[PDB]
Amino acid sequence: TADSRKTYTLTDYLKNTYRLKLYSLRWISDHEYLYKQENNILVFNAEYGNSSVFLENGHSINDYSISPDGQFILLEYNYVKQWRHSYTASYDIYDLNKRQLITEERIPNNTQWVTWSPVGHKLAYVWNNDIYVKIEPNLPSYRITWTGKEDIIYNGITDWVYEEEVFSAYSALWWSPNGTFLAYAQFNDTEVPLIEYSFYSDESLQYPKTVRVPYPKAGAVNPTVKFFVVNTDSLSSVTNATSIQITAPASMLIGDHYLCDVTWATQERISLQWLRRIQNYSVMDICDYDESSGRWNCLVARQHIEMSTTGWVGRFRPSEPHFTLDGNSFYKIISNEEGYRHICYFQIDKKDCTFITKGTWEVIGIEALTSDYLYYISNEYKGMPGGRNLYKIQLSDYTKVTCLSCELNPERCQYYSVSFSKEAKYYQLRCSGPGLPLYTLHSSVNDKGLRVLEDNSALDKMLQNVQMPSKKLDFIILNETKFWYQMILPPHFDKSKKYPLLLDVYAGPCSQKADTVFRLNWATYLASTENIIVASFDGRGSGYQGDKIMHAINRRLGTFEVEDQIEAARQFSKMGFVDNKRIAIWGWSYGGYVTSMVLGSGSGVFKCGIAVAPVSRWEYYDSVYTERYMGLPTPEDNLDHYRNSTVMSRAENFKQVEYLLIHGTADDNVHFQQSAQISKALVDVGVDFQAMWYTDEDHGIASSTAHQHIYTHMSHFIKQCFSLP
Amino acid sequence: SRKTYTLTDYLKNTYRLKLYSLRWISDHEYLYKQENNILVFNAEYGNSSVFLENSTFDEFGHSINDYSISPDGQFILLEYNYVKQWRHSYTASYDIYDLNKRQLITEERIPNNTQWVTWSPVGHKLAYVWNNDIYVKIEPNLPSYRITWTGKEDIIYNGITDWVYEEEVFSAYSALWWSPNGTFLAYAQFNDTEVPLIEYSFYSDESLQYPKTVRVPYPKAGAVNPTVKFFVVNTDSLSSVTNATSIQITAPASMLIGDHYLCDVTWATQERISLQWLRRIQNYSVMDICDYDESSGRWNCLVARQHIEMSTTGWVGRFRPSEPHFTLDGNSFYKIISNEEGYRHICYFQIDKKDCTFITKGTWEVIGIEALTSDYLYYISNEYKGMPGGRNLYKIQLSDYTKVTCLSCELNPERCQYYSVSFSKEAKYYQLRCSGPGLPLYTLHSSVNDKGLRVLEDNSALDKMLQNVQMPSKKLDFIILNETKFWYQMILPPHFDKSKKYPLLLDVYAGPCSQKADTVFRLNWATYLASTENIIVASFDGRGSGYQGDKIMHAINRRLGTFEVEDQIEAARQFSKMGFVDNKRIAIWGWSYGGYVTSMVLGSGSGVFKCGIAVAPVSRWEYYDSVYTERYMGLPTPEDNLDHYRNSTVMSRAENFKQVEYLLIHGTADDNVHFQQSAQISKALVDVGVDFQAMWYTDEDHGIASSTAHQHIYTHMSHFIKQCFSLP
Numbered sequence A: 001t002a003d004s005r006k007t008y009t010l011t012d013y014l015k016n017t018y019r020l021k022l023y024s025l026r027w028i029s030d031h032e033y034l035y036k037q038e039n040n041i042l043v044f045n046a047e048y049g050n051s052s053v054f055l056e057n058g059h060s061i062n063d064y065s066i067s068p069d070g071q072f073i074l075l076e077y078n079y080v081k082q083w084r085h086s087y088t089a090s091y092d093i094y095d096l097n098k099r100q101l102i103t104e105e106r107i108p109n110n111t112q113w114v115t116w117s118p119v120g121h122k123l124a125y126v127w128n129n130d131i132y133v134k135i136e137p138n139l140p141s142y143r144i145t146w147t148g149k150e151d152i153i154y155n156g157i158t159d160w161v162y163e164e165e166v167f168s169a170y171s172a173l174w175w176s177p178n179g180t181f182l183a184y185a186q187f188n189d190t191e192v193p194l195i196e197y198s199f200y201s202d203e204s205l206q207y208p209k210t211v212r213v214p215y216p217k218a219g220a221v222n223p224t225v226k227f228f229v230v231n232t233d234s235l236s237s238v239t240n241a242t243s244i245q246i247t248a249p250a251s252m253l254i255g256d257h258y259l260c261d262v263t264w265a266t267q268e269r270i271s272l273q274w275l276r277r278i279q280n281y282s283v284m285d286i287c288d289y290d291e292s293s294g295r296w297n298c299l300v301a302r303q304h305i306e307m308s309t310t311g312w313v314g315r316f317r318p319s320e321p322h323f324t325l326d327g328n329s330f331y332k333i334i335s336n337e338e339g340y341r342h343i344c345y346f347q348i349d350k351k352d353c354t355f356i357t358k359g360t361w362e363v364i365g366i367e368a369l370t371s372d373y374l375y376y377i378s379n380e381y382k383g384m385p386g387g388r389n390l391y392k393i394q395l396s397d398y399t400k401v402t403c404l405s406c407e408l409n410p411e412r413c414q415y416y417s418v419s420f421s422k423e424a425k426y427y428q429l430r431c432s433g434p435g436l437p438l439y440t441l442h443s444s445v446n447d448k449g450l451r452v453l454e455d456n457s458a459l460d461k462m463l464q465n466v467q468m469p470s471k472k473l474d475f476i477i478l479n480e481t482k483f484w485y486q487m488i489l490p491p492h493f494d495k496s497k498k499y500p501l502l503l504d505v506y507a508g509p510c511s512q513k514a515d516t517v518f519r520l521n522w523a524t525y526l527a528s529t530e531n532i533i534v535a536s537f538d539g540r541g542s543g544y545q546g547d548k549i550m551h552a553i554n555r556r557l558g559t560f561e562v563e564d565q566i567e568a569a570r571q572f573s574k575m576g577f578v579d580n581k582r583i584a585i586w587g588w589s590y591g592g593y594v595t596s597m598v599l600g601s602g603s604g605v606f607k608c609g610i611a612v613a614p615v616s617r618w619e620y621y622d623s624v625y626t627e628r629y630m631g632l633p634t635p636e637d638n639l640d641h642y643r644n645s646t647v648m649s650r651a652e653n654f655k656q657v658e659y660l661l662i663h664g665t666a667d668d669n670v671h672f673q674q675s676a677q678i679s680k681a682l683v684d685v686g687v688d689f690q691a692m693w694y695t696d697e698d699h700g701i702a703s704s705t706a707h708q709h710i711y712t713h714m715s716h717f718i719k720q721c722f723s724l725p
Numbered sequence B: 001s002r003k004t005y006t007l008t009d010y011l012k013n014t015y016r017l018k019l020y021s022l023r024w025i026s027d028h029e030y031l032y033k034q035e036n037n038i039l040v041f042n043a044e045y046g047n048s049s050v051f052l053e054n055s056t057f058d059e060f061g062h063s064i065n066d067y068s069i070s071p072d073g074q075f076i077l078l079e080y081n082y083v084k085q086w087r088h089s090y091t092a093s094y095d096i097y098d099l100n101k102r103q104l105i106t107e108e109r110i111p112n113n114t115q116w117v118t119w120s121p122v123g124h125k126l127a128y129v130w131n132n133d134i135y136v137k138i139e140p141n142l143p144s145y146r147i148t149w150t151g152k153e154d155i156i157y158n159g160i161t162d163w164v165y166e167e168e169v170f171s172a173y174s175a176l177w178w179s180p181n182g183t184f185l186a187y188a189q190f191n192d193t194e195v196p197l198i199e200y201s202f203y204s205d206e207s208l209q210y211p212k213t214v215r216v217p218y219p220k221a222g223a224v225n226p227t228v229k230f231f232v233v234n235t236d237s238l239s240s241v242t243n244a245t246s247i248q249i250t251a252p253a254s255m256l257i258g259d260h261y262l263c264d265v266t267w268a269t270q271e272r273i274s275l276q277w278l279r280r281i282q283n284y285s286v287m288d289i290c291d292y293d294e295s296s297g298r299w300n301c302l303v304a305r306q307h308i309e310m311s312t313t314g315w316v317g318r319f320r321p322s323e324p325h326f327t328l329d330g331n332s333f334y335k336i337i338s339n340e341e342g343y344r345h346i347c348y349f350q351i352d353k354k355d356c357t358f359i360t361k362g363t364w365e366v367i368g369i370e371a372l373t374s375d376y377l378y379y380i381s382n383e384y385k386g387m388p389g390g391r392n393l394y395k396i397q398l399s400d401y402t403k404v405t406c407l408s409c410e411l412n413p414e415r416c417q418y419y420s421v422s423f424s425k426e427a428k429y430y431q432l433r434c435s436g437p438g439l440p441l442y443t444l445h446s447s448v449n450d451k452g453l454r455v456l457e458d459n460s461a462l463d464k465m466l467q468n469v470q471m472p473s474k475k476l477d478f479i480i481l482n483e484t485k486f487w488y489q490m491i492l493p494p495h496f497d498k499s500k501k502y503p504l505l506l507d508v509y510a511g512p513c514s515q516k517a518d519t520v521f522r523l524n525w526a527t528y529l530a531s532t533e534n535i536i537v538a539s540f541d542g543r544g545s546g547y548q549g550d551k552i553m554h555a556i557n558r559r560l561g562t563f564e565v566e567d568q569i570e571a572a573r574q575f576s577k578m579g580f581v582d583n584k585r586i587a588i589w590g591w592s593y594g595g596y597v598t599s600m601v602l603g604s605g606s607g608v609f610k611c612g613i614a615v616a617p618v619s620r621w622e623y624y625d626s627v628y629t630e631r632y633m634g635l636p637t638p639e640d641n642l643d644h645y646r647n648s649t650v651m652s653r654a655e656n657f658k659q660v661e662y663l664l665i666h667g668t669a670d671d672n673v674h675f676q677q678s679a680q681i682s683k684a685l686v687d688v689g690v691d692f693q694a695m696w697y698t699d700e701d702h703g704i705a706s707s708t709a710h711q712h713i714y715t716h717m718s719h720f721i722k723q724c725f726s727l728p
């Protein structure tokens, strides 16, 4: 009479047998959007529901991109991945009057970035590290920049560290809304040291190649930045156009520093956010074009400073300013007196700022700013850090708070994100759990529910045939403070049996792993098929619960986060249904670091662990991330905690545990170096362990074949550790 | 019951073999280090005195790695700051102590980053290499004379080898040869300008923030090789007012027509030198004999004195052309050469005649010529009892070479079947070294009447320790497959029941030229496996091992990864049907060429092997070096042998690994078999969805021989095997 449905199996996960539909769409105006219906790209109506085929069923096309004036379309193909965001591609442009490929002045192959202007059909592209502007797809490119040099000078695109860590994007250029100006950044990596690693390629390659990338590790030379802006409107200087530099404020010129972002606030006002390499001080420069000359006016009474007292500035970087349409006001998320991030309103002419939200909860992002409302996401509802809901607040009197999503579907839906059309006339709401993802469309006017876009009924019906695990989300209180955790529980869970326990850890700063999101992943398999409980715990300083929790780790990575994982397992351990002799832990990247530090703790709580692409020593990781939390590796600053918080210093304690260490050899992010040094430390101390390298894989180990292999291999390891035939 | 031989005993050298390492300094005396200081011994009577007391307060301030006494006993050279490079390559600091006073030499010292130093064969001249250039000192306390000016890191090598010449050709770092006197210094120059680099990462100390890329000129199969020149200097010509002049000797035109190697150089007299050259298609070698012309300063290589070596069945020599052994007069020499039925025997040559007379014959092989006097030749062979894995010393009369005496065969027939020998100057005395199958035994003899003089070391101390350990036994025997017998050994666990069912590890190497079944006493990993874990460790010599004639050896010519692999499987099969072996628990492992075989075996689909360990395997011959690879495989081109290069990769057999448990191990700083090779294996297994185990050892080279890594790799392999064999 026991349940005899199939379980959710490893093959299920790897083959993606059970598909989550995500209804991915792209707004193209205020009332119409783009959606791929299987083989076709449809255009839809927001007001109603009429759709029409836009493009229906040699070159595999990676993406299509239409100009804001509807007259041309770009398609990229021959797509070749670089780093996380960076790519090269070929581009051809077609007409939108006569669906015909433009034959003449064609964008070069090996182009690195392309972008329409916000209006009209202007195009700027980056190729061999220099910026080019096409006045029209048929006419000739104008060369804006002549300094570009492989691995040395980057114009209009980022170098490695700016791509991964500060911009989270490859693009380093910014059209004015007019289309008049084109702003761009220039990066100089001349003195940045290179990470070099072997790349083995196809078996046919007789000698291995070595990849060389400018990559500043903690306390190494950082690249330098310059900011320029060019007038594309009138630039009759066809051979040599004239670029106008805006310097950082003298506040920044005292040492090395970063450009964090640029925002055009109006047609002739641009905002620059700079940050010192000691990332506890950031300045906002407001710069105004003066038509009498060709200069810009930054440094004045318009500077807005942000200092961090108990940590660093922002979560992963200073918050983005949102400007009014007549932009001499802007809204920005800022940590307040009690240490919770809320929205402050700014006036551009001096003054401080005025908060318009408050409470023991955090605004995560401002999603849209209209002439009458500000929309934002927060975890206010039900006091649940792991929840996310859409809110709107009235502009003039900001007391008026409506939640747009909270009560839509409170059982199924506790984790919302949003996508607004042009002018925020409509929005797609995206519910990511704990139910099956639910995707709805709304009009802002009365924010009425128009339609349900996707309800994942299909998946739901399939899953009825499968023994699926449940997820429990709750909290424990260690010394005065609630700390949240989640458990993935085997089907037909029986609190009178003993189950093995896998702690899934990331535990990096700014981070959150106990949440309300629905996932089908490796944990799903472990719970369903192998009857393993998979838990996650957010300790000090996980994110989204105030600075007192988040900043607890400042200048002291690999202490309190590791501590809290241990004693979380101890508490989990005390409940009757957890087998104390079969507790394990695994994690990736920062999670690999914490796993390794836990296993080397000597705690005696954990039987075994798996570390995938771990950091091992903070001097090995990039300057922007680690220096944010760790300061600089010098005697004068924080060298001392840099040295006592390596994995290698704890190798002796690994004698007690079964350890599995995995790393891709072409990891450009966390370098194979880091695991190479862990293994050497373990060897030197006489500790046995298991290892696996993945040839030519990077940080994601994300090739279809490698993806399957790694999870297969980890499943074998876990099962043997827990004595599961 | 008694204690077993445990893994720790192997790793910690608990039970040590004692050696007796001596250095003949004359025709009747040898040096020997006893505990701390250096003794000099009279061979006839065995009495000794102190040559150098236990007082390194001459340096005192540096700990000495090694040292070297000048031939005339006047000086001692000590090295410190020893820094390993490749297999034989290293760099060091050096001081010279003048033994006939008390003081070290302080002015005109040997520079601190020196790459190689050697005394002359007599007297106390010195030649050394520093920044890739050769220097000579006529006296330790006189200034150095610079001989070469072209030296350039990683590009021009004077007096020292580049990678491929060090590893594969000379088997040494040195590329200089003093004449016997020695008035002349001969040296080779290597030019690696157009040789592609192998690049790999070196991670170094934890404190190194950025990994460094190591770049080494290394010719892979069918790439641009280094070129060589050869010179000789008249050292007696160096004076305060006289420059160094380096006379070139050019290769013969039969070599100059294409790519070629310098194989070896042998001084025949104080005025006569032999050089062996080898074509890159290694089917053809030429030996030149060159005479010094007094009033010219030239070296004359008469065409009439050339001798050429060709093969049909295969390549020339075992790993290289054999060495010539010249008579005192220098007008004749003896060389080991393959005969009509493919057996290596001693041929006698006159330097001006092409036709050579064989003076030994039989279905066995001469391994080496050890000594030549005016009346006898001494050599080692495996003739005795028809056992290819035994070695005995014989002597043969030069006149009636039909008169042969075996000098070691019957000295101790049960305990001693594997000998090597060290003769004195002019061969008045010799030390016999017995290496198995019993405990090592060292003896001294007089050549006069092959009288035994005394036992030097009998390892009595080790035997008595070993009486309290459960030691395994060694069985050496053969099977016959078709027309031929093939030899194997088994390490047998103590208490060995021939009806009970034992798990079997096949220990394999099986590279060309090689031998894994023999008479040697070893304390190793297999000893622990047998003694502690009760596992039988077998090895098998198939096609094309030595030392059993060209018929067996050349069988894999141009076909690496075929018959070698077949024969290991067959061997396991014939072991299988023994009542004392469990066919459900057969494993295989090997290192280097042995890792390749292991891998090709496991990927075979044989069904024989449950599991397997490959340590630093070759996976694809295009990845390995020109000299070794092309010897057996020719060139990777359509017109030659590319078809089989492509047919003999481990990667091609990836899908067949589904059925076995595979552990793949490789050091990341392997300069010899590059990590690339295992990296391609792993990728091919990944791409085919085959699970396996892996281990890298960062910064370890081909031998994985660092103290801690050695310990780690063996305990890791032991865990793997035991779990394979359901042992623990």
Ligand SMILES: *[C@@H]1O[C@H](CO)[C@@H](O)[C@H](O)[C@H]1NC(C)=O
Pocket (backbone or CB within 6 Å): A043, A044, A045, A049, A050, A051, A052
């Ligand atoms: C309905 O939407 C389609 C999609 O583009 C559009 O073409 C059509 O004009 C819409 N219908 C009306 C009457 O607006």
Ligand SMILES: *[C@@H]1O[C@H](CO)[C@@H](O)[C@H](O)[C@H]1NC(C)=O
Pocket (backbone or CB within 6 Å): A147, A153, A188, A189, A190, A191
């Ligand atoms: C980049 O910086 C280097 C080193 O300071 C300098 O020589 C060079 O002029 C800079 N390049 C540009 C285009 O600014």
Ligand SMILES: *[C@@H]1O[C@H](CO)[C@@H](O)[C@H](O)[C@H]1NC(C)=O
Pocket (backbone or CB within 6 Å): B040, B041, B042, B045, B047, B048, B049
């Ligand atoms: C050994 O004794 C012999 C015979 O008395 C003597 O001639 C010789 O000097 C001694 N050798 C040494 C090195 O002690």
Ligand SMILES: *[C@@H]1O[C@H](CO)[C@@H](O)[C@H](O)[C@H]1NC(C)=O
Pocket (backbone or CB within 6 Å): B150, B156, B191, B192, B193, B194
């Ligand atoms: C080394 O060979 C190159 C040819 O590639 C040549 O240019 C150079 O002169 C050679 N060096 C010597 C010392 O002959």
